[PDB]
Design an enzyme around this catalytic site. Structure first.
Site, short mmCIF file in Angstrom:
data_model
loop_
_atom_site.label_atom_id
_atom_site.label_comp_id
_atom_site.label_asym_id
_atom_site.label_seq_id
_atom_site.Cartn_x
_atom_site.Cartn_y
_atom_site.Cartn_z
N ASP A 1 9.35 2.83 29.73
CA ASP A 1 10.78 2.78 30.06
C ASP A 1 11.37 1.34 29.97
O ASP A 1 10.68 0.39 29.61
CB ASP A 1 10.98 3.37 31.46
CG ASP A 1 12.26 4.19 31.60
OD1 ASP A 1 13.27 3.90 30.91
OD2 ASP A 1 12.26 5.11 32.44
N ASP B 1 19.75 9.35 28.41
CA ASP B 1 19.03 10.61 28.66
C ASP B 1 19.93 11.82 28.41
O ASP B 1 21.10 11.83 28.79
CB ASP B 1 18.52 10.72 30.10
CG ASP B 1 17.69 9.53 30.55
OD1 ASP B 1 17.37 8.61 29.76
OD2 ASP B 1 17.35 9.52 31.75
#
Ligand SMILES: *[C@@H]1O[C@H](CO)[C@@H](O[C@@H]2O[C@H](CO)[C@@H](O[C@@H]3O[C@H](CO[C@H]4O[C@H](CO[C@H]5O[C@H](CO)[C@@H](O)[C@H](O)[C@@H]5O)[C@@H](O)[C@H](O[C@H]5O[C@H](CO)[C@@H](O)[C@H](O)[C@@H]5O)[C@@H]4O)[C@@H](O)[C@H](O[C@H]4O[C@H](CO)[C@@H](O)[C@H](O)[C@@H]4O)[C@@H]3O)[C@H](O)[C@H]2NC(C)=O)[C@H](O)[C@H]1NC(C)=O
Ligand SMILES: *[C@@H]1O[C@H](CO)[C@@H](O[C@@H]2O[C@H](CO)[C@@H](O[C@@H]3O[C@H](CO[C@H]4O[C@H](CO[C@H]5O[C@H](CO)[C@@H](O)[C@H](O)[C@@H]5O)[C@@H](O)[C@H](O[C@H]5O[C@H](CO)[C@@H](O)[C@H](O)[C@@H]5O)[C@@H]4O)[C@@H](O)[C@H](O[C@H]4O[C@H](CO)[C@@H](O)[C@H](O)[C@@H]4O)[C@@H]3O)[C@H](O)[C@H]2NC(C)=O)[C@H](O)[C@H]1NC(C)=O
Ligand SMILES: *[C@@H]1O[C@H](CO)[C@@H](O[C@@H]2O[C@H](CO)[C@@H](O[C@@H]3O[C@H](CO[C@H]4O[C@H](CO[C@H]5O[C@H](CO)[C@@H](O)[C@H](O)[C@@H]5O)[C@@H](O)[C@H](O[C@H]5O[C@H](CO)[C@@H](O)[C@H](O)[C@@H]5O)[C@@H]4O)[C@@H](O)[C@H](O[C@H]4O[C@H](CO)[C@@H](O)[C@H](O)[C@@H]4O)[C@@H]3O)[C@H](O)[C@H]2NC(C)=O)[C@H](O)[C@H]1NC(C)=O
Ligand SMILES: *[C@@H]1O[C@H](CO)[C@@H](O[C@@H]2O[C@H](CO)[C@@H](O[C@@H]3O[C@H](CO)[C@@H](O)[C@H](O)[C@@H]3O)[C@H](O)[C@H]2NC(C)=O)[C@H](O)[C@H]1NC(C)=O
Ligand SMILES: *[C@@H]1O[C@H](CO)[C@@H](O[C@@H]2O[C@H](CO)[C@@H](O[C@@H]3O[C@H](CO)[C@@H](O)[C@H](O)[C@@H]3O)[C@H](O)[C@H]2NC(C)=O)[C@H](O)[C@H]1NC(C)=O
Ligand SMILES: *[C@@H]1O[C@H](CO)[C@@H](O[C@@H]2O[C@H](CO)[C@@H](O[C@@H]3O[C@H](CO)[C@@H](O)[C@H](O)[C@@H]3O)[C@H](O)[C@H]2NC(C)=O)[C@H](O)[C@H]1NC(C)=O
Ligand SMILES: *[C@@H]1O[C@H](CO)[C@@H](O[C@@H]2O[C@H](CO)[C@@H](O[C@@H]3O[C@H](CO)[C@@H](O)[C@H](O)[C@@H]3O)[C@H](O)[C@H]2NC(C)=O)[C@H](O)[C@H]1NC(C)=O
Ligand SMILES: *[C@@H]1O[C@H](CO)[C@@H](O[C@@H]2O[C@H](CO)[C@@H](O)[C@H](O)[C@H]2NC(C)=O)[C@H](O)[C@H]1NC(C)=O
Lengths: 397, 397, 397, 397
Positions: free
Chosen positions: A129, A189
């Site tokens: 991430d 996302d």
């Protein structure tokens, strides 16, 4: 990356959407057994990826970061052994920052140590991430160096581990990350919604300094079409996880979502419940002919040929001179859509025979539609797709 | 930042708007006594922040920068002692540059020395500006390193000091500053005006290379909604000081301004006169139920759910399964606005029961509106808000 | 910069527009004598700036760069002595790159040496361009370091030299250059045209990566209004040279051009013919009352208060509580324009008395218009201005 | 760059479009012989450029990269000798990255070694791509340093080699590359299509972070007009290869394409079949009068004077006080277009005599149109041009 992995896009399942921070050893093991028993494993979904919130609250004196002892009372390694025994591969999550998006200890400055730990555990896959990165982004070079530190760390363990970037398209990973990783998130996302815009996902194009989250299916598609050109075997654009079955979209919306992710050669990571899979979900995620498009040996994303109001046409090569064609209707009502041979093979013009008779198969219905020349006109549902395979090409030598 | 401070957004008052460069020891002491005596202290407004123009004209031979001896004839420390005696905390201002915005000596390259001075004085809070930064900005990394130098300097004194960034959103502090500071200005300075655009505030979005000043309330709101997603306990988006009572807005405009700053978990720093507080001002700044939204234990900003013409809906979680809901009418005339249960809990769809009967309280009026199901429709004034608390949730397991 | 220079904006004349690469000692000396004899010197235009194409074809073995021996048969120093004898100051041009925009030897990497040469010659002023900079730009820090090298070089000679940046607004010199230089070009070059757009000047806002040239008067005005906020005594935004008299604009267009450059506190550098100055040109460039606005002791640019279609209002403070007000009509036909007291003093609202009777003077006509309250309505020519001074303020304590 | 090369824009032919990865020694030699025999060589097209896919699969132990032994059984040097014998020059392709766009070994970090190899082979020309650059881009400085490494490498061999940048306009090579290279691609790759937009070519302006490919002729023209201002003898904007004869455009579309590339002083690199050149192709690529515009001794690109709907006017200086004028009709139907003397010489206003009688020649038709004053009106085909030479100027002293 040329590391022998992701020769075709990876397929699998991720703990986050279903379990979130309640993730633990038993839930993971039950999901892996469901993946195997339901047939998903043999369809190709072989990675079981443990997302955020596995971490112990602090690193060891040795500097390694172990798993939460309550959630993982045997440690990670014996769980990975159980996953391996099912014929599955295991993934783990961290962030290229001091903390993960969930606020847990992450790997910036500890890349060698953490990679070594994961290799010891038998990990086969890292999702990495971009939270809390301490300003180490804003140019391709800044982001490259930070992601290269972990790429090198993984490599030096000697254990093959699929390197999945999760930096949401920041600084253009389709340019910088292509030889050092296996796939890269291109956007903020996805959420379980077909087309609702959201202020947390402000960007509508590939060029973005705040990727955010709550990006609709349609938002992500409009970003992906710009970067498909960069995708190659071993190095894929990642459109984020599949929402199929979560309930915030209808079946035709999920069909669109799955179709475009498959045809653009995204990783196909299930972000849903695998322990109770409805017939409606199986219809979308267990169609071998659609999976075969994603896993096609030509390794080529389909290209967006045109946009006409709310309608879009996609066309791409498949193996043995065949073609994938998608009619996409982003409008609120069903419509008859037309693809012409000159559009399907636009990049080959003028070397296209529009009179060429070619058999067209509907991959969702798994049936031949018969032979066509010149053009094809089909009913396409609201927020819907028709996914076609042309069994030959109209291209002239 | 994880330094034990700003667990909820900070609240306080700042010398600039009222006193500017006429600031001195006696005016500060009179304002601190008014803050205590009026009840503002006990409501939560406990920081007394000395803004620009406190500085002596030159540094000492020792390199420390003392306060102007005319304005502060005892030095800063004895004034801070007087503030501490009132049960208040003291703040000071500098800039991450060679000069402050007012042209006084600032702290770039003197971070350790200046932090040490402030700690010796008993300072509890630093506002740290972005004027005259010698080109040390333009990437997240450039701005990060400059702000990290002061963060580290403050930390090493051993004295807890709340670190308030004032770089106006340049290079995305919501990304880079979140673990090294307690709050970060996200925009150019607010002015006492509800919606007038100004050429000194050219940017309308979070992405800005000239933050400027004279940004209207509405200008700032449209920037804030993009970055709310990054806010966390100890690390807040700062929408700049409250203009309430200054006179360039009407009461409903100030109510909107205060409501949105409170619900987006901005610091609530009064930028007004505390020595003569009218009843109209007290109604806006002394409502415990509205303050309780800002200070809520779930630490979550409200999200903007939709924009429909000049109307906006905000919705966010509060403690104990309750919800804050705001109807905002940016139009020039009063309007009836409607929020549906499916919109209020959009991110939970499809797990929402729209028929669920729930008590709704009006937080400004401090009265129950009774129970509602499905939707609520209310009168909202021009440039106005209705601020609601739902006493339960419609979310289904 | 705090170097004692440009306390008010600099005024002068530059060789480029009239002489270009045909510049030589005799033409410069004749222009300096015309500047003195015409009265321009005593009006304030005291810098005689030698632009590009003075350079010898190669540096000396010693590494210094001398002037072309044909164009300057005595060298530069004796010419500067002649300029000094006229009570004028001398300027020189180079570029922060390997070559000047005209392709001559420039100063990157030779900053100390070149500054030393200019100081020896008696140079009082440097215009420092941005051509051929070897990729040393694209962040504020990259551009800062390159311009700081010359700023430091000039300083160390011990000779006061006004440092005029010419980097066309790249990377925001209004932020980075303000303490290290006296003025900074904010845009691509002006040309002798009121409003024609040009593909070589693609940017319409302050935020620009290709400043170019052939930027119209109106193009530059729309950029300048964003950055006026940064201007201070000793550190000015530079809107490029005055085209007055060159013939590609009419008199009202030149009046607009001169008025806005003057009121925004741009340097006023004549880019025209000083050896034959028509009455029409003298009317625009020799009005002491307009020059007094540019040279005003409050050092404050006028602000753009509104844009209404093709109409614009500017308002700024002048010394002794007076105000400059400009009505600008960018439309193709004359129009009656209205300024209200609430708009003129917008930033002071609500502390404005709209009924306050105030004498208004027309600075171009050099006559009192009498007293007005509330608003003033005046005829404004096509592409025209009315330039007003309010002899008192409507601001209430 | 000041290396004695590309004094006028380079002209030649490139292997990619016709042969792609099937390129080999015999095909190159047959094309070079066709270039010589057809007359193309004597027209000026003298570079034979070997594009991607010449490379052996791995570097030697010595670290040099040789050619594929099957495709080039004698090595490259003897082929270059054969090319030299035809009176032609030889070019080679690599990338400023670890791999070429085709996935072959490239030169990043091997610049000295590879340049030395090419010099030994007798190479006269390098096309240097931007694929797989390991995040070494995103600022002018990052891209500059990477391209400077190869520029220096070429220089140190002592062999003159024309340095053609292929970085697609990233980070503004018209600024950074002008003294270190001979030409620079300004956009993503052209394709054989007049005006169809494509999602792989998202940018419509010079300012672009994803140059891509499948950029139409019209897309590239709209980018080129912004950067023409930077072009100089020895340092050209490159609009990519000519598609003439490939079949995806009609003759008038190819005429437009060739005309604008020629008049904007692009390199003219044939990206077509030279072994079978139709009469239609010869008409476009073998017109000496059009080539003479590209090769004009004033070295000045034509400027875009206006856009009026789908119509565009270009005007530029040529040698001996003559002017090139282009009427371009981007509309779908033929139209009568008008150029006025005031527009043709706009940058000279007011010093233009609109009544001046001047002979105008049509360069495609190769005939005098006679004398005109004030304006000229001509029929211009759909997607078409008229290319004119004015035999004198209307400019007044
Ligand atoms: C840590 O990092 C390192 C460094 O990245 C990494 O090591 C790499 O690991 C990968 C995966 O195992 C290795 O990749 C394999 O390489 C095989 C050999 O490749 C070379 O040889 C090929 C065959 O040569 C024959 O044919 C040619 C005809 O041209 C002839 O001349 C020869 O004489 C010979 O007979 C050749 O095809 C290949 O060429 C490729 O690359 C070049 C250069 O870019 C290009 O010009 C060509 O177009 C072509 O693309 C190369 O020269 C290879 O066979 C094998 O490929 C098969 O599998 C892959 C997937 O792995 C499929 O994509 C493919 O279709 C094939 O079926 C594979 O690519 C690689 O060599 C390592 N690199 C190094 C430097 O060691 C580690 O794995 C990392 N470790 C960990 C733990 O993470
Ligand atoms: C100069 O800088 C330094 C460096 O930043 C700074 O030092 C920090 O100061 C802060 C503030 O005082 C310290 O923060 C406190 O830390 C307390 C301890 O935290 C750890 O332990 C927690 C409890 O562990 C128990 O429970 C767990 C269950 O999981 C169990 O395993 C254990 O065995 C044990 O029984 C634990 O909860 C906590 O975990 C957090 O963080 C991890 C890692 O990111 C994450 O995985 C978890 O999800 C969780 O978020 C951690 O491991 C802590 O209790 C305390 O928290 C209380 O107050 C805060 C506010 O301060 C509230 O937010 C919170 O709700 C709690 O009520 C607090 O956070 C921190 O430890 C220092 N850091 C270091 C490295 O020293 C200085 O202060 C600076 N000095 C100056 C002058 O400026
Ligand atoms: C090479 O570079 C160097 C470095 O930049 C450069 O050196 C500078 O040169 C300039 C120009 O000569 C110098 O600037 C001058 O400084 C004078 C002194 O300034 C100080 O003292 C002032 C007076 O103090 C009295 O009053 C105060 C009341 O507050 C009282 O306490 C004192 O006890 C005392 O009685 C003071 O006003 C001034 O304060 C300013 O700055 C501070 C800090 O930023 C700020 O807080 C204040 O608000 C105020 O702005 C300062 O402390 C000064 O008087 C003089 O100012 C007059 O002229 C200028 C223009 O020059 C006008 O703008 C102004 O209106 C005044 O009439 C002027 O500014 C500077 O000191 C040098 N700096 C250094 C470090 O040496 C060289 O020149 C360069 N060389 C070459 C060849 O290029
Ligand atoms: C319906 O469409 C299919 C394609 O999907 C058509 O099949 C194709 O038929 C052509 C012509 O008969 C075949 O090409 C031929 O190949 C042979 C070698 O096998 C070659 O000798 C000939 O010169 C010719 O090129 C082609 O192979 C075949 N393709 C596939 C995938 O089967 C079919 O003809 C269509 N039906 C009708 C009624 O037209
Ligand atoms: C008016 O709205 C309020 C909510 O604001 C309603 O109160 C809620 O009532 C429900 C159902 O009676 C309660 O849920 C129940 O909780 C008990 C445990 O206490 C559980 O055993 C049941 O299974 C059920 O889930 C809920 O606690 C309560 N919420 C609050 C905050 O008080 C009220 O019912 C509404 N009035 C009408 C007339 O519907
Ligand atoms: C026409 O406009 C001018 C301003 O441009 C007016 O002059 C101003 O008149 C006021 C009131 O008489 C003056 O204010 C006064 O100042 C004295 C001190 O001198 C003070 O004791 C009073 O309390 C009051 O504030 C002001 O000085 C003066 N301003 C200037 C620049 O002269 C004039 O009154 C207007 N004419 C008419 C008919 O209203
Ligand atoms: C048709 O157009 C051509 C230009 O394309 C005209 O030719 C130009 O004629 C003028 C005036 O006769 C020439 O200028 C003169 O030059 C001589 C020196 O040669 C000078 O002594 C005069 O003072 C005057 O300036 C010019 O050279 C010539 N240009 C060219 C390129 O030939 C022609 O006159 C036009 N025909 C008609 C009927 O107007
Ligand atoms: C798997 O999911 C299905 C479908 O959501 C569940 O079927 C429901 O069962 C519940 C509770 O027993 C009933 O309320 C409903 O009648 C069923 N719904 C539908 C759509 O059939 C099922 O319970 C789940 N399976 C297991 C074993 O838990």
């Amino acid at each position: 990356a040329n590391n022998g992995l992701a020769i075709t896009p990876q397929m699998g399942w991720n703990t986050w959407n279903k379990y979130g921070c309640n993730v633990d050893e038993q839930l993971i093991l039950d999901a892996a057994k469901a993946i195997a028993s339901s047939g998903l494993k043999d369809l190709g979904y072989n990675y079981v990826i443990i997302d955020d919130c596995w971490q112990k609250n602090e690193r060891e004196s040795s500097k390694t970061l172990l798993a939460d002892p309550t959630k993982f009372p045997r440690g990670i390694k014996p769980l990975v052994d159980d996953i391996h025994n099912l014929g599955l591969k295991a993934g783990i999550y961290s962030s290229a920052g001091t903390l993960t998006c969930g606020g847990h200890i992450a790997s910036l400055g500890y890349e060698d140590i953490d990679a070594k730990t994961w290799a010891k555990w038998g990990i086969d896959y890292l999702k990495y991430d971009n939270c809390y990165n301490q300003g180490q982004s804003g140019t391709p070079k800044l982001s490259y160096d930070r992601y290269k530190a972990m790429g090198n760390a993984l490599n030096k363990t000697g254990r093959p581990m699929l390197y999945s970037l999760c930096n949401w398209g920041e600084d253009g990973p389709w340019n910088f990350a292509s030889t050092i990783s296996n796939s890269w998130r291109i956007s903020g996302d996805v959420y379980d919604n077909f087309n609702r815009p959201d202020p947390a996902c402000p960007c509508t194009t590939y060029d973005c300094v705040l990727a955010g989250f709550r990006c609709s299916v349609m938002n992500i598609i409009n970003k992906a079409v710009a970067v498909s050109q960069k995708a190659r075997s071993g190095g894929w654009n990642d459109l984020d996880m599949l929402e199929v079955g979560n309930g915030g979209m209808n079946q035709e919306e999920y069909r669109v979502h799955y179709t475009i992710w498959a045809a653009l050669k995204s990783p196909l990571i299930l972000g849903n419940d695998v322990t109770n899979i409805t017939n409606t979900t199986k219809e979308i995620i267990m169609n071998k002919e659609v999976i075969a498009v994603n896993q096609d040996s030509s390794f080529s994303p389909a290209n967006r040929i045109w946009v006409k109001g709310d309608q879009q046409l996609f066309s791409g090569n498949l193996a043995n001179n065949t073609q994938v064609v998608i009619l996409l209707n982003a409008g609120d009502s069903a419509a008859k859509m037309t693809a012409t041979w000159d559009d399907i093979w636009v990049y080959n013009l003028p070397n296209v025979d529009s009179s060429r008779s070619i058999e067209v198969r509907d991959l969702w219905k798994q049936k031949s539609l018969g032979n066509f020349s010149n053009h094809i006109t089909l009913d396409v549902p609201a927020h819907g797709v028709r996914l076609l395979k042309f069994m030959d090409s109209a291209t002239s030598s």
